[PDB]
Every structure is written in C-alpha cells, then in structure tokens.
Amino acid sequence: MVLYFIGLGLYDERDITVKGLEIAKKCDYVFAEFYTSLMAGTTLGRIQKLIGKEIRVLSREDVERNFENIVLPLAKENDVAFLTPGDPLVATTHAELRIRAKRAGVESYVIHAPSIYSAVGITGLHIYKFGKSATVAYPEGNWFPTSYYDVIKENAERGLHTLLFLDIKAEKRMYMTANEAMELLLKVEDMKKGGVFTDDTLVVVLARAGSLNPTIRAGYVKDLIREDFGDPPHILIVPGKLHIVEAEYLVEIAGAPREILRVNV
Amino acid sequence: MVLYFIGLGLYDERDITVKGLEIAKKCDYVFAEFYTSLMAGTTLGRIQKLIGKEIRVLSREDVERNFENIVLPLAKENDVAFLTPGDPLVATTHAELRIRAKRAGVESYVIHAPSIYSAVGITGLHIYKFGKSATVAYPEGNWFPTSYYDVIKENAERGLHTLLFLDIKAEKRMYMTANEAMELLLKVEDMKKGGVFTDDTLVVVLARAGSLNPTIRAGYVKDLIREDFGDPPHILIVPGKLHIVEAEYLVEIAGAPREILRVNV
Ligand SMILES: Nc1ncnc2c1ncn2[C@@H]1O[C@H](CSCC[C@H](N)C(=O)O)[C@@H](O)[C@H]1O
Ligand SMILES: [Cl-]
Ligand code: NA
C-alpha cells in the first residue's frame, strides 16, 4: 500500500542515504530509472548487490506513459520502491508521478539524496547566487535551440550564476562534454553576439560530483575549451560577478588563474 | 592526514549517505556544528551511536574564529571529520574552511547529503525555475533587513520561483517559522509598497523536509499566515509564474485552492 520515491545520489552505489537503503531493503519490489541521469561511478549490479534486491529497470516510456500500470498496481498490496539518480522529484516530470499515485489510492513517501543542484556548492560559488537553470542541447536537423544562452544572459545581467546541465543520451550512453558545451555556446554567441559567452568568459566545470575525487576546474573559455576534464558526466557553470570569497576558492581549490581576482570580482 | 566535510542530511541521523557513514566510522576525531540548520528528527546521542564515535560540537565562534586551531591541528596527524546538517556547503560559509585546510597543508574531501535546496522538489515546483535565493532575517534593534523583498521582486518579474531560507538563532534555540516570515514580508510590503508580497500572494510552505511526513502547504498569505505548520525548520517559497502541472501538484498534494489551477497565461 506504499510507494517510496528513493534517491540514489550523485555518483556511486554509496550515495544513497542510510534511510533510503534500509527502506529499499524492506520493499517487496524495486524499480529504477536511469534515463534522467546515469550513476557513472557504479553499476546496476553493484546497486542490486548493495540493496540485495532484484531491480527492474524502467525506460522513459515505461515511466511517463505506463507508471500506473507497471509500478502502482504492485504498490497497492506491497511496499514498492522507485529509485532515481540524485534527489527524487528534481527531474521536472517526476513530481507529477505522485499525483498518479494518489489517484490510484497509493500512499507515497519521498526519501531524499544528494542532488547536483546542491552538490555544485563544492565549486565555492554561493548557492543563493544561482539564478534560473538550463540544459544545453545538441542542435539537429533544422533545429538549433538557444534558450540556454538567454538564460545565462538574464542571470549574469543580475549578477547570478547559471547552472547548465549538458545533453545526455542515456540509452545510447552518449554524454555531452563541457568542451562540446563551450564550443556550442561560442557558436551561439557568434550568432547572437550578445557578448554573453566568449573566449574571455569565466566558466567553471564540475565533473563527477559525488566522487571522492571530483574534477573542479575554473578558468577562461579560451584556456579550458580543450582541457581534459575526465569522464562524464560534466556540468558547466557560467558564474556572474564574483564575491571575493568565491574567487579565492576558485583560485585555491579549482586552479583558477589569479587573474579572476581582479577581472571577475 | 585528512579532513572530511560530511553532511548529515535534512531531518534525522539516517539522512546521512552510506558513503558518509562508513567514512565517519573510520575517522579518529569527529567534530560537528548544528548552528547552520536544524535536524528536528534526531539528537547528538542518536548520531553518535550510528557513527559509533564521540562528537565534539563546535559553536559558530569556534568554527569561524578557531577552526584552524581546534580542528586542523588534529587533521595533520589523524583522519578528522566535520559534520553539518544538510549539505555542508549549501547556504553556509563552510566552503571557505576548505581554503584554511589547504593553507594548513591538510587535504580535504566533501561528502554530500540531502539539502533543503533540492528537497524543494517535493513542493512540485520545477527546480530549474527557481531564481536567486534569499534569507528572511529577524530584525534587530533599529536594523530591519529588507533585501529579501527585492529578491522576490526580481525573480517574480522574470517569472521565477523564490526560495526563502528562514533565520535561526541556534544558541537561543529560535527558529523562524513561515508565519513570522510572512508577517515580516507584509511589513516590508507596507513600507516599500511594490505589490510584491500581499495577502493575495500565493506562497508555499515546506516544514521538516526529510521526515516521512513533512508539512507541504500552498495558498494565499491571508489564509496561511496564521496556520500551524508544525515544528521547525520551515522554508518559505514565493512561486513565480506556474506551469499547469506545478499548479496541479500544489492543489492535489499541497492542498492549494483549486482556483490556482486556472493559471493566467
Ligand atoms: N529539513 C528542513 N525542512 C525545512 N527547511 C529546512 C530544512 N533544513 C533546512 N531548512 C531550511 O534552511 C535553513 C538552514 S540554511 C543551511 C542549509 C543546509 N546546508 C542544507 O544543505 O540544507 C533553515 O533555517 C530552514 O529555513
Ligand atoms: Cl564489480
Ligand atoms: Na537553482
């Protein structure tokens, strides 16, 4: 009679919370989805081993179109868990899933876990200074989306940082790298010329947040556009004007050039 | 020979991640602070049993003035852990402590945990739509902080949601309730008269996120300003322009007035 939305955290099988693991262990059925994000530091096998349960993976279609036929029926007479990378309900469409549960007469509870939205605090950039967030998508066919550029512009105009998620083809396991993101933004800048993203723009790259050895790098596009940030997933941040403490952290912890202490503060 | 910043999560001792527990278990010395937030579902004793270690609690002064004198010295010859509610770097000034660590020749690692910043997802409001965040501070003496009012105004004009962290006076054991925040906001509205926060403003209240039964309520200030949302901690959110699905969730789960479903495109 209960459905548990349980977050798996950021990187590996150990990013689940103690509460989340213990609850997952007591559930009769365990479902999971890895299309919104992928746990780059672990495997389904390792997660299953830790929880000690067989995990049925669901595709985007399974969830978006048939959640009420796959998951909810079982939650009517059993305890069921729905595992998702990060924190549950962060993915835009997941919250609506609780409405579906309600209508099916199923009680639902949310067990939180670390999300990239809060993990970015490791970059030293103040969380309150982040503005609207966006996703950088690959153009294709006659479609060249550029709204993420406008997001950066509006946030930066207000001295706010912009968190940019990069395109992911979960099924095909194809990750957009920070490098590709920068190349795309430079291309959008060449088209809109708003002076929003140029070779002189200061950016921050965070790779493998959650890992004990994440890659946190800060610098100008002209210098980082070809740097090796390691394996995905990658997150790109275009900070607004910096508080001196943010700048000092980027220099001391993220190897940013001393130059940002006078140019971007 | 190392310092770990480990988050404990939102509500109780089980909100810590598995990674964080296993590491905190092997540390020689464990310090902690509980002045940046409130974990309403646990106690120092319960946390100590889980970790199986004695924990030295530090005050804001111990940390801000003597972190390098109390904690770092030990990290040079031992594996030390510094615990904090939620995520250690979110809406705190702890990130700067990593710099002190570097200066002291101590390598540091960050172990994330559920944060109120991403837990807002449980309100049904799309997390990417939140803009600049702010804190509602208790006026002191003739000093009456009002900048948080302008943050709401700025976000609202852009159609973005505004997250409002509420004040805390840990030593005095004072925790600002959503009710007190609303009263302060109405007073600022009276002074500034920007039509930003009135009795007809729609707001969302989230209390004790992380618990299995948090209070999630949405409605007009006139109706919620005197409502009992339960024990602290509380967070206040002033939504911007709502998507239909956000409104649906607020009505179905947060008990919001059905009239909001009728969004004004
Ligand atoms: N479980 C919880 N429920 C509701 N609000 C919470 C909360 N935990 C923290 N807050 C809110 O955030 C404020 C602390 S700000 C520090 C936040 C912390 N580093 C984190 O990652 O969550 C509190 O005063 C309160 O307004
Ligand atoms: Cl293996
Ligand atoms: Na945000």
Side-chain angles (χ1 to χ4, degrees), chain B residues 87-153:
Chain B
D87 181 291
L89 307 182
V90 178
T92 70
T93 55
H94 298 326
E96 180 271 324
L97 299 182
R98 296 199 75 199
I99 298 181
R100 302 189 197 182
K102 183 185 175 188
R103 316 283 196 183
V106 177
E107 283 287 296
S108 73
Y109 294 78
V110 181
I111 308 308
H112 302 285
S115 170
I116 185 63
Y117 193 70
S118 68
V120 306
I122 200 167
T123 66
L125 300 176
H126 302 333
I127 184 158
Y128 74 92
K129 292 178 63 179
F130 280 73
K132 180 179 190 176
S133 304
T135 301
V136 177
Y138 275 126
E140 242 70 61
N142 292 172
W143 188 254
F144 198 125
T146 68
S147 70
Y148 52 82
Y149 179 84
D150 302 315
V151 173
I152 301 174
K153 180 185 172 183

Coordinates of all heavy atoms in Angstrom, one line a residue, chain B residues 87-153:
Chain B
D87 N 23.6 19.6 3.6 CA 24.8 19.6 2.8 C 25.8 20.6 3.4 O 25.4 21.8 3.5 CB 24.6 19.9 1.3 CG 25.9 19.8 0.5 OD1 26.7 20.6 0.6 OD2 26.0 18.8 -0.4
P88 N 27.0 20.2 3.8 CA 27.9 21.2 4.4 C 28.3 22.5 3.7 O 28.6 23.5 4.4 CB 29.2 20.3 4.6 CG 29.1 19.3 3.4 CD 27.6 19.0 3.4
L89 N 28.1 22.6 2.4 CA 28.5 23.8 1.7 C 27.3 24.7 1.2 O 27.5 25.7 0.7 CB 29.4 23.5 0.5 CG 30.6 22.6 0.8 CD1 31.4 22.4 -0.4 CD2 31.4 23.3 1.9
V90 N 26.1 24.2 1.4 CA 24.9 24.9 1.0 C 24.4 26.0 2.0 O 24.0 25.6 3.1 CB 23.8 24.0 0.6 CG1 22.5 24.7 0.2 CG2 24.2 23.0 -0.5
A91 N 24.4 27.2 1.6 CA 23.8 28.3 2.5 C 24.6 28.3 3.8 O 24.0 28.5 4.9 CB 22.3 28.1 2.7
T92 N 25.9 28.1 3.7 CA 26.8 28.2 4.9 C 28.0 28.9 4.3 O 28.0 29.2 3.1 CB 27.2 26.8 5.4 OG1 28.1 26.2 4.5 CG2 26.0 25.9 5.6
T93 N 29.0 29.2 5.2 CA 30.2 29.8 4.7 C 31.3 28.8 4.9 O 32.5 29.2 5.0 CB 30.5 31.1 5.5 OG1 30.5 30.8 6.9 CG2 29.4 32.2 5.3
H94 N 30.9 27.5 5.0 CA 31.9 26.5 5.2 C 32.9 26.3 4.1 O 34.0 25.8 4.3 CB 31.2 25.2 5.6 CG 30.4 25.2 6.8 ND1 30.8 26.0 7.9 CD2 29.3 24.6 7.2 CE1 29.9 25.8 8.9 NE2 29.0 25.0 8.5
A95 N 32.5 26.6 2.9 CA 33.4 26.4 1.7 C 34.7 27.1 2.0 O 35.8 26.5 1.6 CB 32.8 27.0 0.5
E96 N 34.7 28.2 2.7 CA 35.9 28.9 2.9 C 36.9 28.1 3.9 O 38.1 28.3 3.9 CB 35.6 30.3 3.6 CG 36.8 31.2 3.9 CD 37.3 30.9 5.3 OE1 36.4 30.7 6.2 OE2 38.5 31.0 5.6
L97 N 36.3 27.2 4.6 CA 37.0 26.4 5.6 C 38.0 25.5 4.8 O 39.0 25.0 5.4 CB 36.1 25.6 6.5 CG 35.2 26.4 7.4 CD1 34.3 25.4 8.2 CD2 36.0 27.3 8.2
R98 N 37.7 25.2 3.5 CA 38.5 24.3 2.7 C 39.8 25.0 2.4 O 40.8 24.4 2.2 CB 37.8 23.9 1.4 CG 36.5 23.1 1.6 CD 36.2 22.3 0.3 NE 37.1 21.2 0.1 CZ 37.3 20.6 -1.1 NH1 36.6 21.0 -2.2 NH2 38.1 19.6 -1.2
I99 N 39.7 26.4 2.3 CA 40.9 27.2 2.0 C 41.8 27.1 3.2 O 43.0 26.9 3.1 CB 40.5 28.6 1.7 CG1 39.6 28.6 0.4 CG2 41.8 29.5 1.5 CD1 39.2 30.0 0.0
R100 N 41.2 27.3 4.4 CA 42.0 27.2 5.6 C 42.7 25.9 5.7 O 43.9 25.7 6.0 CB 41.2 27.4 6.9 CG 40.4 28.7 6.9 CD 39.7 28.9 8.3 NE 38.7 29.9 8.2 CZ 37.9 30.3 9.3 NH1 38.2 29.7 10.5 NH2 37.0 31.1 9.1
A101 N 42.0 24.8 5.3 CA 42.5 23.5 5.3 C 43.8 23.4 4.4 O 44.8 22.9 4.8 CB 41.5 22.5 4.8
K102 N 43.6 23.9 3.2 CA 44.7 23.9 2.2 C 45.9 24.6 2.8 O 47.1 24.1 2.8 CB 44.3 24.6 0.9 CG 45.4 24.6 -0.1 CD 45.0 25.4 -1.4 CE 46.1 25.5 -2.4 NZ 45.8 26.5 -3.5
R103 N 45.7 25.8 3.4 CA 46.8 26.6 4.0 C 47.5 25.8 5.1 O 48.7 25.9 5.2 CB 46.2 27.9 4.7 CG 45.2 28.6 3.9 CD 45.7 29.5 2.8 NE 44.7 30.5 2.3 CZ 44.9 31.3 1.3 NH1 46.0 31.4 0.7 NH2 43.9 32.2 1.0
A104 N 46.8 25.0 5.8 CA 47.3 24.2 6.9 C 48.0 23.0 6.4 O 48.5 22.1 7.2 CB 46.3 23.9 7.9
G105 N 48.0 22.8 5.1 CA 48.6 21.6 4.5 C 47.7 20.3 4.7 O 48.2 19.2 4.6
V106 N 46.4 20.5 4.9 CA 45.5 19.4 5.1 C 44.6 19.2 3.9 O 43.9 20.2 3.5 CB 44.6 19.7 6.4 CG1 43.6 18.5 6.5 CG2 45.5 19.8 7.6
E107 N 44.6 18.0 3.4 CA 43.8 17.7 2.2 C 42.4 17.5 2.7 O 42.2 16.9 3.8 CB 44.3 16.4 1.5 CG 45.5 16.6 0.7 CD 45.2 17.3 -0.6 OE1 44.4 16.8 -1.5 OE2 45.7 18.5 -0.8
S108 N 41.4 18.0 2.0 CA 40.0 17.9 2.4 C 39.1 17.3 1.4 O 39.4 17.4 0.2 CB 39.4 19.2 2.9 OG 39.2 20.1 1.7
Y109 N 38.1 16.6 1.8 CA 37.2 15.9 0.9 C 35.7 16.3 1.4 O 35.5 16.4 2.6 CB 37.3 14.4 1.0 CG 38.7 13.9 0.4 CD1 39.8 14.0 1.2 CD2 38.7 13.4 -0.9 CE1 41.1 13.6 0.6 CE2 39.9 12.9 -1.4 CZ 41.1 13.0 -0.6 OH 42.3 12.5 -1.1
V110 N 34.8 16.3 0.4 CA 33.4 16.7 0.7 C 32.5 15.5 0.4 O 32.5 15.0 -0.7 CB 33.0 17.9 -0.1 CG1 31.5 18.3 0.3 CG2 33.9 19.1 0.2
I111 N 31.7 15.1 1.4 CA 30.7 14.1 1.3 C 29.3 14.8 1.4 O 28.9 15.3 2.4 CB 30.8 13.0 2.4 CG1 32.2 12.5 2.6 CG2 29.8 11.9 2.1 CD1 32.8 12.0 1.3
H112 N 28.6 14.8 0.2 CA 27.3 15.5 0.2 C 26.2 14.7 0.9 O 26.4 13.5 1.2 CB 27.0 15.7 -1.3 CG 27.9 16.5 -2.0 ND1 28.1 17.9 -1.9 CD2 28.9 16.2 -3.0 CE1 29.1 18.4 -2.7 NE2 29.6 17.3 -3.3
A113 N 25.1 15.4 1.1 CA 23.9 14.8 1.8 C 22.7 15.6 1.3 O 22.9 16.6 0.7 CB 24.1 14.9 3.3
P114 N 21.5 15.0 1.5 CA 20.3 15.7 1.1 C 20.3 17.2 1.6 O 20.6 17.4 2.8 CB 19.2 14.9 1.7 CG 19.8 13.5 1.8 CD 21.2 13.8 2.2
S115 N 19.9 18.1 0.8 CA 19.9 19.5 1.1 C 18.5 20.1 0.9 O 17.8 19.7 0.0 CB 20.9 20.3 0.3 OG 20.7 21.7 0.4
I116 N 18.1 21.1 1.7 CA 16.8 21.7 1.6 C 16.7 22.4 0.2 O 15.6 22.5 -0.4 CB 16.6 22.8 2.7 CG1 15.1 23.3 2.5 CG2 17.6 23.9 2.5 CD1 14.1 22.3 2.8
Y117 N 17.9 22.8 -0.4 CA 17.9 23.4 -1.7 C 17.4 22.5 -2.8 O 16.7 23.1 -3.7 CB 19.4 23.9 -2.0 CG 19.4 24.8 -3.1 CD1 18.9 26.1 -3.0 CD2 20.0 24.4 -4.4 CE1 19.0 27.0 -4.1 CE2 20.0 25.3 -5.5 CZ 19.5 26.6 -5.3 OH 19.5 27.5 -6.4
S118 N 17.5 21.2 -2.7 CA 17.0 20.4 -3.8 C 15.7 19.7 -3.2 O 14.8 19.3 -4.0 CB 18.0 19.3 -4.2 OG 18.2 18.4 -3.2
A119 N 15.6 19.6 -1.9 CA 14.4 19.0 -1.3 C 13.1 19.8 -1.7 O 12.0 19.3 -1.6 CB 14.5 18.9 0.2
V120 N 13.3 21.0 -2.2 CA 12.1 21.8 -2.6 C 11.4 21.1 -3.7 O 10.2 21.5 -4.0 CB 12.6 23.3 -3.1 CG1 13.4 24.0 -2.1 CG2 13.3 23.1 -4.4
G121 N 12.0 20.2 -4.3 CA 11.3 19.5 -5.4 C 10.1 18.8 -5.0 O 9.1 18.6 -5.7
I122 N 10.0 18.5 -3.7 CA 8.8 17.9 -3.1 C 7.5 18.8 -3.1 O 6.4 18.3 -3.0 CB 9.0 17.3 -1.7 CG1 8.0 16.2 -1.4 CG2 9.0 18.4 -0.7 CD1 8.4 15.4 -0.2
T123 N 7.8 20.1 -3.4 CA 6.6 21.0 -3.4 C 6.0 21.0 -4.8 O 4.9 21.6 -5.0 CB 7.1 22.5 -3.2 OG1 7.9 22.9 -4.3 CG2 7.9 22.6 -1.9
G124 N 6.6 20.3 -5.8 CA 6.0 20.2 -7.1 C 6.4 21.3 -8.0 O 6.1 21.3 -9.2
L125 N 7.1 22.3 -7.5 CA 7.6 23.4 -8.3 C 8.9 23.0 -9.0 O 9.8 22.4 -8.4 CB 7.9 24.6 -7.4 CG 6.8 25.1 -6.6 CD1 7.2 26.2 -5.6 CD2 5.7 25.6 -7.5
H126 N 9.0 23.2 -10.3 CA 10.1 22.8 -11.1 C 11.4 23.5 -10.5 O 11.5 24.7 -10.5 CB 10.0 23.2 -12.6 CG 8.8 22.5 -13.2 ND1 8.2 21.4 -12.7 CD2 8.1 22.9 -14.3 CE1 7.2 21.0 -13.5 NE2 7.1 22.0 -14.5
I127 N 12.4 22.7 -10.1 CA 13.6 23.2 -9.6 C 14.4 24.1 -10.5 O 15.0 25.1 -10.0 CB 14.5 22.1 -9.0 CG1 15.7 22.7 -8.3 CG2 14.9 21.1 -10.1 CD1 16.3 21.7 -7.3
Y128 N 14.3 23.9 -11.8 CA 15.1 24.8 -12.7 C 14.5 26.2 -12.7 O 15.2 27.1 -13.1 CB 15.2 24.2 -14.1 CG 13.9 24.3 -14.9 CD1 13.7 25.4 -15.7 CD2 12.9 23.3 -14.8 CE1 12.5 25.5 -16.5 CE2 11.7 23.5 -15.6 CZ 11.5 24.6 -16.4 OH 10.3 24.7 -17.1
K129 N 13.2 26.3 -12.3 CA 12.6 27.6 -12.3 C 12.8 28.5 -11.1 O 12.2 29.6 -11.1 CB 11.1 27.4 -12.5 CG 10.6 26.9 -13.9 CD 9.1 26.6 -14.0 CE 8.4 28.0 -13.8 NZ 6.9 27.7 -13.9
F130 N 13.6 28.1 -10.2 CA 13.9 28.9 -9.0 C 15.0 29.9 -9.5 O 15.9 29.6 -10.2 CB 14.4 28.1 -7.8 CG 13.3 27.4 -7.1 CD1 12.6 26.3 -7.6 CD2 12.9 27.9 -5.8 CE1 11.6 25.7 -6.9 CE2 11.9 27.3 -5.1 CZ 11.2 26.2 -5.6
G131 N 14.8 31.1 -9.0 CA 15.8 32.1 -9.3 C 16.7 32.4 -8.1 O 17.1 31.4 -7.4
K132 N 17.2 33.6 -7.9 CA 18.0 34.0 -6.8 C 17.3 33.6 -5.5 O 16.1 33.8 -5.4 CB 18.3 35.5 -6.9 CG 19.2 36.0 -5.8 CD 19.5 37.5 -5.9 CE 20.6 38.0 -5.0 NZ 20.8 39.4 -5.3
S133 N 18.1 33.1 -4.5 CA 17.5 32.8 -3.2 C 17.8 33.8 -2.2 O 18.7 34.7 -2.4 CB 18.1 31.4 -2.7 OG 17.8 30.4 -3.7
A134 N 17.2 33.8 -1.0 CA 17.4 34.8 0.0 C 17.1 34.2 1.4 O 16.4 33.2 1.5 CB 16.7 36.0 -0.3
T135 N 17.4 35.0 2.4 CA 17.1 34.6 3.8 C 16.3 35.7 4.4 O 16.7 36.9 4.3 CB 18.4 34.4 4.6 OG1 19.2 33.3 4.0 CG2 18.1 34.0 6.0
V136 N 15.3 35.3 5.1 CA 14.4 36.3 5.8 C 15.1 36.4 7.2 O 15.1 35.4 8.0 CB 13.0 35.8 6.0 CG1 12.2 36.8 6.8 CG2 12.4 35.6 4.6
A137 N 15.6 37.5 7.5 CA 16.3 37.7 8.8 C 15.5 38.5 9.8 O 14.8 39.4 9.5 CB 17.6 38.5 8.6
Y138 N 15.7 38.1 11.1 CA 15.0 38.7 12.2 C 15.5 40.1 12.3 O 16.7 40.3 12.4 CB 15.3 38.0 13.5 CG 14.4 36.8 13.8 CD1 15.0 35.5 14.1 CD2 13.0 36.9 13.9 CE1 14.2 34.4 14.5 CE2 12.2 35.8 14.3 CZ 12.8 34.6 14.6 OH 12.1 33.5 15.0
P139 N 14.6 41.1 12.4 CA 15.1 42.5 12.6 C 15.8 42.5 14.0 O 15.4 41.8 14.9 CB 13.9 43.4 12.5 CG 13.0 42.6 11.6 CD 13.2 41.1 12.1
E140 N 16.8 43.4 14.1 CA 17.5 43.5 15.4 C 17.7 45.0 15.7 O 18.3 45.7 14.9 CB 18.8 42.8 15.4 CG 19.0 41.6 16.4 CD 18.1 40.4 16.0 OE1 18.3 39.9 15.0 OE2 17.2 40.1 16.8
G141 N 17.2 45.4 16.9 CA 17.3 46.8 17.2 C 16.6 47.6 16.1 O 15.5 47.3 15.7
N142 N 17.2 48.7 15.7 CA 16.6 49.6 14.7 C 16.9 49.0 13.3 O 16.5 49.6 12.3 CB 17.2 51.0 14.8 CG 16.7 51.7 16.1 OD1 17.2 52.8 16.4 ND2 15.8 51.0 16.8
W143 N 17.7 47.9 13.2 CA 18.1 47.3 11.9 C 17.0 46.4 11.5 O 16.7 45.4 12.1 CB 19.4 46.6 12.1 CG 19.9 46.1 10.8 CD1 19.9 44.8 10.3 CD2 20.6 46.9 9.8 NE1 20.5 44.6 9.1 CE2 21.0 46.0 8.8 CE3 21.0 48.2 9.7 CZ2 21.7 46.5 7.7 CZ3 21.7 48.7 8.6 CH2 22.0 47.8 7.6
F144 N 16.4 46.7 10.3 CA 15.3 45.9 9.8 C 15.7 45.5 8.3 O 15.5 46.3 7.4 CB 14.0 46.7 9.7 CG 12.8 45.9 9.6 CD1 11.7 45.9 10.5 CD2 12.6 45.0 8.5 CE1 10.6 45.2 10.4 CE2 11.5 44.3 8.3 CZ 10.4 44.3 9.3
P145 N 16.3 44.3 8.2 CA 16.7 43.8 6.9 C 15.6 43.7 5.9 O 14.5 43.3 6.3 CB 17.3 42.4 7.2 CG 17.8 42.6 8.6 CD 16.7 43.4 9.2
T146 N 15.8 44.1 4.6 CA 14.7 44.0 3.7 C 15.1 43.5 2.3 O 14.2 43.4 1.4 CB 14.0 45.4 3.5 OG1 14.9 46.3 2.8 CG2 13.6 46.0 4.8
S147 N 16.4 43.3 2.1 CA 16.8 42.8 0.8 C 16.1 41.6 0.2 O 16.0 41.5 -1.0 CB 18.4 42.6 0.8 OG 18.7 41.4 1.5
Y148 N 15.7 40.7 1.0 CA 15.0 39.5 0.6 C 13.7 39.9 -0.2 O 13.3 39.1 -1.1 CB 14.7 38.6 1.7 CG 14.0 39.2 2.9 CD1 12.6 39.4 2.9 CD2 14.7 39.6 4.1 CE1 11.9 39.9 4.0 CE2 14.0 40.2 5.2 CZ 12.6 40.3 5.1 OH 11.9 40.9 6.2
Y149 N 13.2 41.1 0.1 CA 12.0 41.5 -0.5 C 12.3 41.8 -2.0 O 11.5 41.5 -2.9 CB 11.5 42.8 0.1 CG 10.3 43.5 -0.5 CD1 9.0 43.1 -0.1 CD2 10.4 44.5 -1.4 CE1 7.9 43.7 -0.6 CE2 9.3 45.1 -2.0 CZ 8.0 44.7 -1.6 OH 6.9 45.4 -2.1
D150 N 13.4 42.5 -2.2 CA 13.9 42.8 -3.6 C 14.2 41.6 -4.4 O 14.1 41.6 -5.6 CB 15.1 43.8 -3.5 CG 14.7 45.0 -2.7 OD1 13.6 45.6 -3.0 OD2 15.5 45.5 -1.9
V151 N 14.7 40.5 -3.7 CA 15.0 39.3 -4.4 C 13.7 38.7 -5.0 O 13.6 38.3 -6.2 CB 15.6 38.2 -3.5 CG1 15.8 36.9 -4.2 CG2 16.9 38.8 -2.9
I152 N 12.7 38.6 -4.2 CA 11.4 38.1 -4.6 C 10.9 38.9 -5.8 O 10.4 38.4 -6.8 CB 10.3 38.2 -3.5 CG1 10.8 37.4 -2.3 CG2 9.0 37.7 -4.0 CD1 9.9 37.6 -1.1
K153 N 11.0 40.2 -5.7 CA 10.6 41.1 -6.7 C 11.3 40.8 -8.0 O 10.7 40.7 -9.1 CB 10.8 42.6 -6.3 CG 10.3 43.6 -7.4 CD 10.7 45.0 -7.0 CE 10.4 46.0 -8.1 NZ 10.9 47.4 -7.8

